[model samples]
Target: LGKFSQTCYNSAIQGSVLTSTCERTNGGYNTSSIDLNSVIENVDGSLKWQPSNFIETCRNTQLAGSSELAAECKTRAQQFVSTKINLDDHIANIDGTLKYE
Candidate 1:
């Protein structure tokens, strides 16, 4: 349990850092050669490849135990998920435009 909790904590920290970096780098983009998919994949990949029950376990164990820090980690995780969703929508729009145009 300790190792699992520690791994979860580390993942939360890493996800936070990657999300913040993505926001800082891509927050104000009109158009460019930057591949948004690559940026979003890191976050999405982290969350996706985990076990289906990982989030519940993380919340019940590590997150619930850490108090304020856990809250912040949750916030970061939410932000990462939100960003990925937004980017996915953007990509879909781009694909639609390409299909029609």
Candidate 2:
């Protein structure tokens, strides 16, 4: 849990790169998910952008932020899963030194 918290804290700092700005956009650092309309709003309410461009904008910002954070979270989750598996294996191999909780 401690390691997981540390990873999250680091990711939050990385995501804060966007929030550090004062620009008002439909999808800025404060936005959790970005949409086409939101992207347009972010660009001074421009309605002349292509769908592909909007998708790219969303991917470049929100999805990328999520992916960066997920990297650390996944690592911690895997470690926890492996630790539990090892504990189970140790219990199976032990005799009377360990007792079931």
What does candidate 1 score in Cα RMSD to the true structure? 19.3
Location of the lowest summed lDDT over 10 successive residues in candidate 2: 65-74
After superposition, candidate 1 runs with Cα above 4 Å error:
1-31, 42-68, 72-101
TM-score of each: 0.13, 0.13
Instruction: Name the lDDT value of residue 16 in candidate 1.
Output: 29
**Pairs with steric clashes in candidate 2:** none
Task: For candidate 1, report its TM-score.
Answer: 0.13
Error of 1 at 5 (Å): 43
- lDDT for 48 in candidate 1 is 33
Instruction: List the pairs of residues colliding in candidate 1.
Output: none
Model 1, 47-93: lDDT tens digits are: 33323333542342222332222311245345422111122322334
C-alpha RMSD for every candidate: 19.3, 21.2
